[PDB]
Amino acid sequence: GYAHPEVLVSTDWVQEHLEDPKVRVLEVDEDILLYDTGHIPGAQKIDWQRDFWDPVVRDFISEEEFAKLMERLGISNDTTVVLYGDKNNWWAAYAFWFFKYNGHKDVRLMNGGRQKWVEEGRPLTTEVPSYPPGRYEVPYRDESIRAYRDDVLEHIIKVKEGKGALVDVRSPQEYRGELEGALRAGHIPGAKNIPWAKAVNPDGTFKSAEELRALYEPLGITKDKDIVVYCRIAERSSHSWFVLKYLLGYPHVKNYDGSWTEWGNLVGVPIAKGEE
């Protein structure tokens, strides 16, 4: 089975923990207005750009700001945070990554996302919770899961020595250089293409550990290597990062948040086109 099934909860699990004092459910959607129309009872809304991004520079909010957000959401350090959203949990996986970047110990993703909960006809409400402030100590960012532009060159070499791998989760067209825009098209040299959606079933749930392994192992993307995953922006590569590190247990996996919007616009950086 999965390496970390404990970080994946079912819709049944969530419905039976709607009143757990140690549980805080958050809906994280690409469509920041969807929550307003109806959500899981007791769930709170995360507006990604406004809540996780600095208002002026391209970077996430500070550790201090993260702690204030948590308290406002009634979340404490020992809180079991449960995430779900639209698009096969695309954005919810992003929130998962960000929570882990801030070191939150107990974060879980609802298998199937908003899609499955709605399809099953489980409780929905437009009523928004009013939880008492949480107690969240200032976290320490975990750099082992975030990759930066100045780490790529040395990674590109690691990919050649068979010590690392690059996972491009974009469409094959973008991957090949036929391509959140950029002045250049192609992929980071050495990267392999595994479109993110290949990890999920039509109903929004994740594929089996076996089916997932089959997406990466045959392409040389193995646990013994340091992995770097990217898309156009971090928000879209977090899903595959989650699949590799948590569902498949890869110990070294980083999310390159800069992704193509940064790389494809950088001056004088290596770029490969075609297949690899």
Side-chain angles (χ1 to χ4, degrees), residues 181-249:
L183 294 175
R184 306 313 266 166
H187 56 81
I188 304 178
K192 285 289 182 175
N193 187 42
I194 298 89
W196 76 274
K198 291 169 60 65
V200 302
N201 298 127
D203 75 341
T205 62
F206 286 108
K207 290 184 177 177
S208 70
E210 183 174 62
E211 298 176 300
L212 291 176
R213 290 189 301 268
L215 302 178
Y216 307 105
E217 304 183 315
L219 297 180
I221 309 298
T222 51
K223 305 186 302 181
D224 56 293
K225 305 176 185 176
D226 292 328
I227 312 295
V228 169
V229 189
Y230 73 91
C231 161
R232 286 195 297 280
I233 61 177
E235 289 67 22
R236 303 181 198 291
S237 45
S238 300
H239 192 275
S240 298
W241 166 85
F242 173 81
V243 169
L244 291 160
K245 187 163 186 183
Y246 289 90
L247 300 187
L248 297 186

Side-chain angles (χ1 to χ4, degrees), residues 32-105:
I32 61 174
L33 289 173
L34 184 53
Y35 171 92
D36 299 26
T37 68
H39 47 270
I40 294 180
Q44 286 169 286
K45 171 185 174 180
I46 286 299
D47 214 69
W48 73 282
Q49 268 220 298
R50 181 236 298 172
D51 300 327
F52 296 159
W53 274 54
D54 182 80
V56 185
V57 303
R58 183 183 181 171
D59 214 327
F60 301 100
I61 59 176
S62 64
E63 298 87 322
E64 296 60 48
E65 283 302 308
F66 184 81
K68 281 53 182 181
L69 177 59
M70 299 302 105
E71 305 204 327
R72 179 166 65 65
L73 294 169
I75 295 175
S76 302
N77 293 269
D78 71 341
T79 292
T80 294
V81 174
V82 177
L83 311 172
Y84 79 97
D86 58 5
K87 314 292 282 294
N88 309 103
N89 280 325
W90 209 7
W91 252 237
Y94 158 66
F96 192 103
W97 174 80
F98 191 49
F99 270 69
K100 286 303 183 181
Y101 180 51
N102 282 282
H104 199 270
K105 294 183 179 60

Side-chain angles (χ1 to χ4, degrees), residues 6-38:
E6 76 282 0
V7 307
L8 193 65
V9 295
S10 63
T11 47
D12 174 71
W13 186 99
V14 174
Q15 193 168 323
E16 300 307 296
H17 289 268
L18 295 178
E19 299 181 300
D20 192 316
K22 291 291 180 179
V23 172
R24 292 284 178 266
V25 180
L26 311 174
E27 188 175 322
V28 191
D29 310 313
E30 175 159 52
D31 183 316
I32 61 174
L33 289 173
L34 184 53
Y35 171 92
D36 299 26
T37 68

